[PDB]
Amino acid sequence: HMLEENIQEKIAFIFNNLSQSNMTQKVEELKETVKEEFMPWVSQYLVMKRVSIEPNFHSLYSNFLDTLKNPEFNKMVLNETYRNIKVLLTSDKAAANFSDRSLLKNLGHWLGMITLAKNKPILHTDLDVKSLLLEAYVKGQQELLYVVPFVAKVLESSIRSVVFRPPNPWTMAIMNVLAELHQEHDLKLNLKFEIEVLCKNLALDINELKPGNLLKDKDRLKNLDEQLS
Amino acid sequence: QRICEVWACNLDEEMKKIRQVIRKYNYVAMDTEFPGVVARPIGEFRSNADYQYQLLRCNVDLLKIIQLGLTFMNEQGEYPPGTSTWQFNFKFNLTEDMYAQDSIELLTTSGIQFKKHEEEGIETQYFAELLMTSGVVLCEGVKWLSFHSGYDFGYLIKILTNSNLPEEELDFFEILRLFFPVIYDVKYLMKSCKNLKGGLQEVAEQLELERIGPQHQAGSDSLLTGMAFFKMREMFFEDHIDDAKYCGHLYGLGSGSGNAYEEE
Ligand SMILES: [Cl-]
Ligand SMILES: [Mg+2]
Ligand SMILES: [Mg+2]
Ligand SMILES: [Mg+2]
């Protein structure tokens, strides 16, 4: 529906069958059979129609971007990623919306891979992860459920990065907010678990983190720049 | 209002501004102040090829930064309206920390308020956290201007990595290039400018520059560094600098091959 069906299936076929071996083939297929002008749309297709739903192939799709070696395209993909994360983060949330949360998680994982994993920062003007967590904390369980798993997924990609790998001060700043949320008595079972798992993935001892007293600022919580709806 | 003084209480507030000027002003001129040098590394001899770095590492791991000064500029050497230079003042405690006696006296003479630093100084790890995601580091497009600055970047790397510096000089540059893709060390460039020699203040005088603010403080030094670059670029380099020739080479260290330490 975003592209006329002929041009649509043409690029659907590039990513339809993708592998380690046919990688360089498919990257040339794309470079020739598709016009440069459609690349912003190829970038939407990749983020929305593939990456969002199939987390099993994120390494492949990342290898693709690597092989393609196109920075202006890589930039498009990063903006598309942020745009969609925004839509979901400012959506009408409901207990029932499992699908929306799944998409946000995958888009989180993907964001980690194309920024952190590649020694590039998640810019404060694009996304303020620390404030997202605190805002989630004041708005409710629902918002937390939408946000903690999502933040976990993006941080998973810090271990693979000489820059953000612990004990990076930003990475550890985020981890310390999570460590404080984990101390909260009425934090859903599944999110205490999600946070625990994240520590093991980063080879961290949850108990050695240094929780702060941010959740008690109140005055600060009242003045956050909202990133949620 | 040309040079803003930053402490703990107004760091968050000023980063908010820096976050924005970096977009339009991608040239960053920098200088630090710290308690000098107190030691020579054990087991290393001056004759070693990497001795200058090993001497840097030895003292940076051991001592705490006292001031960072950042001055923002653009392609043509213009400044943003209002403040163009921020002077970050870091937590420092003369009872607890280490220092070379002379440096504290010189820094004191220059106007450093050591008691205010002890009480209202910025924590360096919190400062790293905020710099990390501000566009001022790690991002392409930005360009760092410096002066005899091996030790300056050693502190910035120590702060951004929250770790001791890498054992080997090779490794220090690898991680250095990630945080700071493009660096120009005016004192390095000066090795190609007949009749330009000396410290920052001396070079400032030969180039007929007018220093704004207190000498031997970071903010003012960074702004003078900034001026010395854009003035030197037109006068000796025809308003263009060859990356392959000059980018990334810090004065006194092994890249671009004579003391790394900015003696007085
Ligand atoms: Cl320090
Ligand atoms: Mg200096
Ligand atoms: Mg050795
Ligand atoms: Mg100085």
Numbering used by the authors:
A (entry chain A): 1089 to 1317
B (entry chain B): 10 to 266, 274 to 280
Authors' description from the paper:
The interaction between NOT1 and CAF1/POP2 connects the NOT module to the catalytic module and thus is central to the assembly of the CCR4–NOT complex. Given the crucial role of this interaction, we have solved the crystal structures of the isolated CAF1-binding domain of human NOT1 (residues 1093–1317) at 2.90 Å resolution and its complex with CAF1 (i.e. CNOT7) at 2.70 Å resolution. The structures reveal that the CAF1-binding domain of NOT1 adopts an MIF4G fold; thus, this domain was termed the NOT1 MIF4G domain. CAF1 (i.e. CNOT7) and POP2 (i.e. CNOT8) are one-domain proteins that adopt an RNase D-like fold.
The crystals contain three complexes per asymmetric unit. The final structural model includes all residues of the NOT1 MIF4G domain and residues Q10–S266 and G274–E280 of CAF1 (chain B). The NOT1 MIF4G domain binds the convex surface of CAF1. The buried interface is relatively small (712 Å2) and exhibits both shape and charge complementary. The interaction is mediated primarily by residues from loops L(α6–α7) and L(α8–α9) in NOT1 and by residues from α-helices α1, α5, α6 and α7 in CAF1. Most prominently, NOT1 residue P1257 (at the N-terminus of α-helix α9) functions as a central knob; it inserts into the CAF1 surface between α-helices α5 and α6 and contacts A137, M141 (α-helix α5) and the C-beta atom of N171 (after the end of α-helix α6). The MIF4G domain of NOT1 binds CAF1 opposite to its catalytic site, leaving the catalytic residues accessible to RNA substrates. Due to the presence of 200 mM MgCl2 in the crystallization condition, we can now observe electron density for the catalytic metal ions in the human enzyme. Difference density in the active site was attributed to two hydrated magnesium ions (MgA and MgB) and a glycerol molecule from the solvent. In the structure of the NOT1-CAF1 complex, the C-terminal CAF1 fragment encompassing residues G274–E280 is visible in the electron density. This fragment includes three consecutive glutamates (E278–E280) and shields the active site of the enzyme.
